[PDB]
């Protein structure tokens, strides 16, 4: 409850990881609350009225990771699904049992009857996260089979990248590991200026390539054997994946007809739906969906983003209608207009994957990144033809959604696919004053079809209290969740207005919030829950999404915004504010509880060069990547015992990973690195290339506390905030 | 001997005229009943003429440019020759500086009046063969077609170019080779494409047309793996078959890859077109394919719009110089009436059977690739026929497999016939049997036939044929002209006229008007006395040829399907005289114990019980067993060694049938019937106004009556 | 010429296996799910229903209903033989597990046998009543 003066601390970042706030609830109610990783709110203490919310100047909203992989999941198979007869809210641990045979709905307050099927001991009332077996009324059609369609760019530029070699090899290794049963269907399409289909029949000596050159009028050439059964045609698929990277070695096709290629891929998956994987390497220049080139901005252009055409938006809406999701793999070395291409994944519940300047021989970093990301992309669980409803207690109203989906009528989120790595955000307002209740509940119902052909409903329920004073609102503030919601709000501000407005609204979010806290209590005074608020916002303003005076290119910025709108809150925080450790002096204060493994726990350092040292090495955890920066004057012990090298001069320029040496210093750093990646499914690639002169030291671009020739330092920032707070 | 003269001129020059003495005045020229015409075979075979590797002598006259011929007056002292067409005198070329009266060039000996030169100058172009395969047919019919096309692959020259276009609902243009994927371009069979669009949508040899010696291995595997059209056929429906589009893509492909060079578009169909341009019938089985009765009562909506599509492709490819063959084998009609112009305007073949899985088709298909003594196909490509005549002769036109080049000159007549209005024609495909009918008008006499074409070896050749017929002596005009009349040639030449007007519409009225007129001028009679009418030996067979012509399937189209009538007319407009007389009037041999095989009359009186007949219609070999021999055969007298003579009787017509069952290119359907048998109908309909006796009596009453 | 196949338990209308291919489906799948509800142990074991331009066919064996939809011109003789081929295979594989399951479409993987058997009938190479009455 204490008040912090940010101008005297300058060391407020804790040495241990940040934990989400515990809502100020009763001991028996909070113990049943939802896991904060699956469901969390910006304000754990909900403001009673909208006037109190506007006074606090903090955004109210939710951030949910609904399909995340779980260690344990209760699966109810009851012959009936107990839902409130008014608002269809599933029975949750936060209802009110009165008559023992009647329960009060925590969202619409209507009393319901408990069916003849200790009722409070029912598993539907003892788990905030549960999964049902949906009855026959919860499906428009029989459960669709798992369908996978891969669409590859095979133009001359794509063949030069060499991406087809690694992509086809990963498919062969993970062919049995694809989610699905004996109903699984798989298909392939390549394209340059013409669309190439690939029929697969056991009666033929080899697969047959069928070309559609009528670009203005695509069609499906064959009624069968284009989408084939993977179980029956296993051998026929394996031959094509070994022959595909050899059919276009001498290709002189330069133009890519991506637009018409997606239309043919849509017509192919339109009957059944499923997941459509698209690999693209250059600008779409031929046919519908053609995009004009664009000159990249430099560090000398002001903030003067939006799609160039509505084609890929209109096309994604048709894919969503047929339960088809499009994942876009962009492996381009030049401009490709991702502001327009990304619409194919935003409005179809897909997800984009960006690999700048991918080359099989010239960029081994992007090669191993595509290797590990495809390992996750092909083996993670999946849901088909899915929808998600987000219900909140009466009085609260959702008014803006964030993520990759299509908002149907009556706030229904359409998800052609649902993947366990997708995060969403919701902004809401107090439509009616919460003077009646002291608790409010939020429930997200995820209806989907599993890979085994089963309609399942995953439900998460969160419970939060209601407060009526300014100080009680600031006390329950989640600073990490506020930064996540503001980043999503600023991304929409960029498209709607401009990038300058998106940056001004982010600074005004800190100004107005602390200006209101000051008007209700010399230096810069903040509550303890917001001691890191100006730090994470400055980090937001220096991320590749909103940075101004940098040499950033157009595709880098839009992908940094596609990750704001799509990644969970934790990895958004790891990207915006990476965790910096010193890893040349690992000791035994770690988590040596886990058997033989010791796992050192070095303290988190702040993102400033002042914290670095030329006498050692520093590891940085950016969520998707791990960078180890080696100082020039590093000790000979760390070079020989950890790097396996006799001097700083003989450290290989691109070092793809550390060697597992026969030294205890190697075991300590391998144990610490292993512990980092075990916390996440997406394997983060480590590269020790960061040197003091590798020309790849973007390691410094994450030093958000320090000043540059185009941004303020952390302390320069605090002086500007105080100047405006008491203006 | 006039008979000896007619026979020798056809053996040497490959020509047979209706009149061998021509009217020397404007009086008789306008009154000639049968026009002056010729049955000219540009590539007729003969006892080993030496291929003359010369350069044809060019007349110094610009308009004339006729080829040196034995009719040209030479002066071996002054080293000159006078062109017999324009009287222009010429200087002999340097290579002819040493020609003497004892050593003179071959083009001046009357034995070499018809001659062929070989012109070797430019690099030779390879032969091109484009297979167009229908996939909407039964497995047994598709399998046999696959084996036959694999057989023809092993007979092609190593340098020839080949391509594969399979079609069903879609059209696939296969890319050969490609090493391990076998790719192809797919197109909608619902809309037509021009050659310019197809060129842009696709991109010496091509990716689609590769030499045999490099691609035969993969093409044999591709053809061996061809399967049915994968689209299902719902109950009560026909397959969706896009014939009119696959042909326009085959035409369009060669049109933008190898224009103006010999190429064969070989299309194989197993049913009618049911989709896209060139549609013949709907897809519902309840609607029968159109018949002549449906044609006449306007119950066929796809005929006119279908024929127009195939006339456009016929003229497109014939302008480019490419040949379209049509191999049609199905149980129902297939639409030959709508597609007839493609093999007719070009020099393409037309094979019509019941199924591809028959000995009829398989053997007929390998006759197409029958080779000569030097192992070369008996087919020519890109023929250009130019006819040069005396200043007293004008050309009305030609009736046969040809296309007008629309070249004008003093030899073109205002009265055009068939494909007229020109003195130059293009025949994209010709064989040693291809016969044209050229009709001449009068406004010695000489005509020079110049035929430039591409040999099956790639050598560019020119066949020159110069002939001469006497002008009638003024004091013996109709007398000499009557003796020089060829009744067999005039019959087919006049029949060639009737089938043309019928196929491009009464016609029987014009036939009888000309037969009566010919009787009134060259017959002998007193007025109003029919019994006093007689005809000379020169004319005594002409009315009998007209009798079997007006009752034939060529003019009485009913009792046949529209495809069968178009097939009959197809082969008639191309054959020589010997085969044409067999079509109009089938020959008939008799086999009995009392005597060796003898030719007999085509009348119901020849049908005896104790005798075996062998009727040769050009399209049907029919063996008829009388009632007595049928009973003698149903009894079992043949197997007994007592009647080895009865075995000779039952197999004598079979032996004679096998010989002509192999030489004839459109292998005739073999029929073994007897009295009371079903297939005995074909014999009784060709046999017998009504009958010839009544037909002659009616003719004589009109010949001796008013003129 | 077109098919819509459903296998359901007659007692409660619980779906067991189906197969649908379009490239509407919403009106006749509804009308299919009413039949599964109206049918009981007094229903005709063999029947054919007229739905204007469409026509349903079903047989009932071992408390299991094998329903198929097709355009009215599809041969009635072939639709019943198609349902018999499905029943003879389904009763052998899952016939004993039918009365115990509780999930909808507990035999989706029967999808594979339906479509391969379906293709052998829509390629040419008992009671009758109006469906609107029963509904
Ligand atoms: Zn409720
Ligand atoms: Zn001359």
Residue numbers in the entry:
A (entry chain B): 348 to 464, 476 to 662, 666 to 882, 888 to 1093
B (entry chain A): 3 to 205, 225 to 464, 476 to 537, 541 to 723, 746 to 764
C (entry chain C): 1 to 23, 29 to 130, 148 to 157
Paper text:
The packaging of cargo transmembrane proteins into COPII-coated vesicles entails a direct interaction between COPII protein and cytoplasmically-oriented ER export signals. The ΦC export signal was identified in studies of p24-family and ERGIC-53 proteins, and comprises a C-terminal signature of a pair of hydrophobic residues or a single terminal valine residue. The ΦC motif contacts a site on Sec24a that is also the binding site for the LxxLE- and DxE-class export motifs.
A series of ΦC-signal peptides was synthesized, based on a core sequence of yeast Emp24p, and individual peptides were soaked at high concentrations into two crystal forms of human COPII protein: one comprising Sec23a/Sec24a•Sec22b, the other Sec24c. For all ΦC sequences, we observed clear evidence for peptide binding to a site on Sec24a in the Sec23a/Sec24a•Sec22b crystals, based on the presence of residual electron density that matches the peptide sequence (this binding site is occluded in the Sec24c crystals). The finding that multiple classes of export motifs bind to a common site is surprising, but the COPII•ΦC crystal structures highlight that the common molecular feature is carboxylate-group recognition by the clustered arginine residues of the B site—the terminal carboxylate group of the ΦC motif adopts a similar position and bonding arrangement to the carboxylate of the glutamate side chains of LxxLE and DxE motifs. Thus, specific recognition of the ΦC motif involves the terminal carboxylate group bonding to Arg750 and Arg752 of Sec24a, with the penultimate hydrophobic residue of the motif nestling against Tyr496, and the terminal hydrophobic residue fitting to a pocket of hydrophobic side chains.
